[PDB]
Amino acid sequence: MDFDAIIIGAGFGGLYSLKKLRDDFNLKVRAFDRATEVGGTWFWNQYPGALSDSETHLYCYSWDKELLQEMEIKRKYISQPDVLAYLKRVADKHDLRKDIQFETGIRSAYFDEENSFWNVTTENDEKFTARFLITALGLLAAPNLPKIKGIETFKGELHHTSRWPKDVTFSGKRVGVIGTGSTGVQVITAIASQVKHLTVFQRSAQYSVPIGNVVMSETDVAKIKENYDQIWENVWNSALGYGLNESTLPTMSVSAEERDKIFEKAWQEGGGFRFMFETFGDIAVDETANIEAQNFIKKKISEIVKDPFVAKKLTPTDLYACRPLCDSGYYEIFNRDNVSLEDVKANPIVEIKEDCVVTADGVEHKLDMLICATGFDAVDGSYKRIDIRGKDGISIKDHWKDGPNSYLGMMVSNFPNMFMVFGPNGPVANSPPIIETQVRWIADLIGYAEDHQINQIEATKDAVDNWTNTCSDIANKTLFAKVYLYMGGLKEYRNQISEVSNNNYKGCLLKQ
């Protein structure tokens, strides 16, 4: 054994995995990332307007009290360069880089049934052994590059938001953006005013609410820092972990005039999760409540966008409101004389030539730059791109050929000593609280094993099948996926995994 534990990922999930196992448990551990710096997705995604979905004071670690007091809280939400600097500062303080090997992908990890440890091989064919594998792998980008005929003949700049280069300049250029998910909304709002002309190619109009990202006064920051203990106590006690007053008020239980008042209030403060969960308690459950949320945003769209035909094209049709987008002036962009909206569901892209994008009606859209706002992959994907083989050498690709499944979102049957952080079938909540929860739980279980010299931990097939049903029970009660995620929220997730730890890890296969 080279190591007690090998960590893959130096993002949020891997940086804390490392800190927890090396320093609070005195294990020998080494971590690996392909990146040249810590930060994970905040290192790779440097596109214009990249901004957190959670507010600054909560998109961070809770476990280091003196870091909370030290933290710079510039704006209500935190931009990508600032998150990256924060993660780097976490590394400086807790001396984590000496145990991270950068520029090092992992090609494969094979479980050794004979000695109960993992054989892990880099892409440069270096081989390390470790009792425990910790996978903190995040989500890769969704669509590689758009499967469009002739895209490779394009002779202008072709930029993917997940490999955004440095020194992109926009002035004097005709620019095109494929994609209008969260990443596309941020790019487009960021660059519309910098280009000579912007063409947006929207496949599918989405609902978006104001983010309301404002500067924080020194007294604003003091309010938070003086009460940080209560703030975090409210995170652990909530469903989402976003600092919201999570409503229980049914949408249809009030007058139209009161209902308009409550949505307006969330709209003025900003934030997608606020609009969806702080206004009423059933927007994501009741079809009739959801339509009320839909119409409020549709009306706002039609009041902000002055040209009714452009506004009509922006209006989501039939689509229900699920998974919340926010923006810093998105719908306003479309009143600008230098912006055009192309509905590419009505008028698909058929071809890309050397100087242009051409749609089904024959029109050539001439472009100097084409931006592919990639989105994000189901993941699953990040795991299916490492050769992971457990017992009798089944690959993870085979074991999940028909969808991912796990125990509590962290352990996979047939894959012992492997613990996933922020993996499939996990909760839907603010990420750092989820990551912290899972890392402390994993670390506690590895300590139990250390004290009781057990060297093979594994989830049964039945713990995993019970977990798959717990998720489908909760999920088939929601408008979402109308599954593969636990949606009882953060507090109920922490119960689930407390019961297991308090019942000598019922469902697990402690061995030796």
In the complex, which residues of this chain contact ligand FAD (CB under 6 A)?
8-14, 32-35, 40-41, 45, 50, 52-54, 59, 105-106, 136-138, 382, 386, 422, 430-431, 435
The residue of the chain with the least Cβ separation from ligand FAD equals 40
Q: How far is the CB of 293 from ligand FAD (least distance, A)?
A: 21
Question: Cα separations (Å) of 475 from 322, 468, 478, 483, 488?
Answer: 13, 11, 5, 6, 8
Nearer to ligand FAD, 30 or 313 (CB): 30
Nearer to ligand FAD, 79 or 456 (CB): 79
Q: How far is the CB of 471 from ligand FAD (least distance, A)?
A: 19
What distance lies between CA 43 and its chain's CA centroid?
A: 14
Q: How far is the CB of 70 from ligand FAD (least distance, A)?
A: 21
Nearer to ligand FAD, 12 or 154 (CB): 12
Nearer to ligand FAD, 105 or 447 (CB): 105
Nearer to ligand FAD, 438 or 455 (CB): 438
Structure tokens at 227: 């009460």
Nearer to ligand FAD, 417 or 431 (CB): 431
Structure tokens at 379: 């993941």
Q: How far is the CB of 153 from ligand FAD (least distance, A)?
A: 30
The DSSP bridge pattern shows strands 3-8 and 127-135 to be parallel
Nearer to ligand FAD, 78 or 148 (CB): 78
Q: How far is the CB of 431 from ligand FAD (least distance, A)?
A: 3
For the chain, helix, strand, coil in percent to 5 are: 40, 20, 40
334 Cβ neighbours under 8 A, 6+ residues apart = 200, 305, 307, 310, 311, 314, 341
Q: State how far the Cα of 390 lies from the Cα of 396, in Å rounded to an integer.
A: 8
Nearer to ligand FAD, 83 or 178 (CB): 83
Nearer to ligand FAD, 39 or 416 (CB): 39
Q: How far is the CB of 338 from ligand FAD (least distance, A)?
A: 26
Helix (H) or strand (E) holding 110: strand 106-112
CB 70 within 8 A of CB 86: no
- Look-up of token digits 């000598």: 504
Q: How far is the CB of 36 from ligand FAD (least distance, A)?
A: 10
Q: How far is the CB of 106 from ligand FAD (least distance, A)?
A: 4
- Look-up of token digits 């392909």: 34
Helix (H) or strand (E) holding 491: helix 490-502
CB 240 within 8 A of CB 66: no
25: amino acid identity, one letter: F
Measured over all CA atoms, what is the biggest interatomic distance in the chain, rounded to whole angstroms? Answer: 71
CB 283 within 8 A of CB 276: yes
User: Rounded to 5 degrees, what are φ and ψ at 338?
Assistant: -100, 20
Q: How far is the CB of 107 from ligand FAD (least distance, A)?
A: 7
Q: How far is the CB of 186 from ligand FAD (least distance, A)?
A: 7
Nearer to ligand FAD, 45 or 294 (CB): 45
DSSP, collapsed to helix, strand or coil, labels residue 85 as helix
Nearer to ligand FAD, 294 or 430 (CB): 430
264 C-beta neighbours (distance < 10 Å), count: 13
CB 203 within 8 A of CB 180: yes
Q: How far is the CB of 223 from ligand FAD (least distance, A)?
A: 21
Q: State how far the Cα of 190 lies from the Cα of 372, in Å rounded to an integer.
A: 15
Q: State how far the Cα of 188 lies from the Cα of 198, in Å rounded to an integer.
A: 8
Q: Rounded to the nearest 10 degrees, how much is the dihedral formed by the CA atoms of 151, 153, 157, 158?
A: 20
Structure tokens at 458: 């594994």
